[PDB]
Structure formats: structure tokens, C-alpha cells
Amino acid sequence: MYQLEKEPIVGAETFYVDGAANRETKLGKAGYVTNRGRQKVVTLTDTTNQKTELQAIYLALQDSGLEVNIVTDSQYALGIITQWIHNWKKRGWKTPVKNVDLVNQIIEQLIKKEKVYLAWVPAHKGIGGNEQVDKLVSAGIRKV
Ligand SMILES: NCCc1ccc(O)c(-c2c(O)c(O)c3c(c2O)C(=O)c2c(cc(O)c(C(=O)O)c2C(=O)O)C3=O)c1
Ligand SMILES: [Mn+2]
Ligand SMILES: [Mn+2]
Ligand SMILES: [Zn+2]
Ligand SMILES: [Zn+2]
Known part of the structure; x- marks a missing residue:
């Protein structure tokens, strides 16, 4: 329904998002740091690495203005969101099984925006920015 930006929105605040989880305890953290000097880290239970990456994106959408740049290192998070946008109101589309509720909450936030740029970086x-938020979410979750 939506058109994600082809290139970063010049002037807009940039959210470097990340999440990390531990398989053995299902504990995790999701959060962001921004180039305007904000950060946020929330601790989560009963979660997975994929879920934490999506949760970080949700937090960035929740806390940002109408134009937002988001940089994630989760190929999965970026792909499942982009695929949702490209294939809604379209034929031959079965919604994904995993994390469907969280992705629906994210898309909810996405359409409320004016412009969103979403990019993957390894x-x-x-x-x-990606390095900083990595240390924040990895603290007490996985060794670095
Ligand atoms: N110093 C360099 C090495 C280094 C050091 C600290 C780090 O934290 C990481 C490190 C991350 O912080 C991280 O968040 C991720 C990865 C990292 O490696 C991944 O690799 C990775 C991540 C998400 C994904 O969805 C995939 C996928 O979907 O396939 C992969 C994938 O590997 O395939 C992902 O989120 C890597
Ligand atoms: Mn990550
Ligand atoms: Mn990371
Ligand atoms: Zn605007
Ligand atoms: Zn970097």
C-alpha cells in the first residue's frame, strides 16, 4: 500500500535499531540509538532474536516523528516488513506464520508515517550507530 523511500530522508532523525536474545533463557533486549542523541533499551522475556529485531523497529516507529530513517542489521526484519507492504491487496499472498502479531503492530505504525526509510547494514x-546499539542490547544477553 505504502512506498518506502529509495534513499535516506535528508534532514530526518536516524534510528540505529538492534535486538539480541539468548536461546537458553529466552531473555533479550531491543532498542535504538539516534543521531540526535536519544537512546532506549527495553528488556524482554520469552523472546527470540528475530522478535527483538522487530521490536526495536517498532520502538523506533513509536518514538519518531512523521519522517524517520531506520537502520537495522536484521535482513529478516527488513524482508518481512517490505514483503508485507509489497504484497498486500495482491494475489497469491499467504501471510507469514511466525511473528505475525508483532509485524502487524509494526505495519500499523508504518502507515501512520509520512515517509520511512528502512535500510539493512551488516x-x-x-x-x-549500529555498533553502539549492539553493545547496549548485547549487554548481559550474549558475549561480544
Ligand atoms: N564484530 C563483527 C561480528 C559481530 C559482532 C557483534 C555482533 O553483534 C554481530 C551481529 C549482530 O549484532 C547482529 O545483530 C546480527 C548479526 C551479527 O552477526 C547477524 O549476523 C544477523 C543478524 C540478524 C539477522 O536477521 C541475520 C539474518 O537474518 O540472517 C543475521 C545473520 O547472520 O544472518 C543480526 O542481527 C556481529
Ligand atoms: Mn541485530
Ligand atoms: Mn547487532
Ligand atoms: Zn514531512
Ligand atoms: Zn557502523
């Missing part, structure tokens, strides 16, 4: 070493 996780990497450094001092940039």
Missing part, C-alpha cells in the same frame, strides 16, 4: 566493528 553488523560490523567500529564506533558508529
Whole structure:
């Protein structure tokens, strides 16, 4: 229904989102850091790594203005969201089984926006945004 931006929205605040979970305890964290100096980290129970990545995106949509840049390192989160947008009101579309409720909450937030840019980056070493939020969500969840 929607058109995600082809390139970052110049001027808009950028949310570097991430999540991490531990399979053995199902504990996890999801959150963001932004280039305007905000951050947020929430602790979650009964969750998975995929669920935490989606939850971080939901948090960024909840806390942002009408134009938002979001940078994720979850290929899954980006793919399931983009596929939802491209295939609604379209033939031959079976909605995914896993995480359907969370993705529906995200799409809810997405359509309320004016412009959204969503990009995937591989996780990497450094001092940039994806690295910072990685350390935040990995604290006490997985070794780094
Ligand atoms: N110092 C460099 C190595 C390093 C150090 C610290 C890190 O935290 C990570 C690291 C992440 O922080 C991270 O969040 C992720 C990964 C990382 O490797 C992934 O690899 C990864 C992630 C999400 C995904 O959805 C996939 C998928 O969907 O397939 C993959 C995939 O591997 O395939 C993902 O979220 C990597
Ligand atoms: Mn990640
Ligand atoms: Mn990461
Ligand atoms: Zn606007
Ligand atoms: Zn970086």
C-alpha cells in the first residue's frame, strides 16, 4: 500500500535499531540509538532474536516523528516488513506464520508515517550507530 523511500530522508532523525536474545533463557533486549542523541533499551522475556529485531523497529516507529530513517542489521526484519507492504491487496499472498502479531503492530505504525526509510547494514566493528546499539542490547544477553 505504502512506498518506502529509495534513499535516506535528508534532514530526518536516524534510528540505529538492534535486538539480541539468548536461546537458553529466552531473555533479550531491543532498542535504538539516534543521531540526535536519544537512546532506549527495553528488556524482554520469552523472546527470540528475530522478535527483538522487530521490536526495536517498532520502538523506533513509536518514538519518531512523521519522517524517520531506520537502520537495522536484521535482513529478516527488513524482508518481512517490505514483503508485507509489497504484497498486500495482491494475489497469491499467504501471510507469514511466525511473528505475525508483532509485524502487524509494526505495519500499523508504518502507515501512520509520512515517509520511512528502512535500510539493512551488516553488523560490523567500529564506533558508529549500529555498533553502539549492539553493545547496549548485547549487554548481559550474549558475549561480544
Ligand atoms: N564484530 C563483527 C561480528 C559481530 C559482532 C557483534 C555482533 O553483534 C554481530 C551481529 C549482530 O549484532 C547482529 O545483530 C546480527 C548479526 C551479527 O552477526 C547477524 O549476523 C544477523 C543478524 C540478524 C539477522 O536477521 C541475520 C539474518 O537474518 O540472517 C543475521 C545473520 O547472520 O544472518 C543480526 O542481527 C556481529
Ligand atoms: Mn541485530
Ligand atoms: Mn547487532
Ligand atoms: Zn514531512
Ligand atoms: Zn557502523
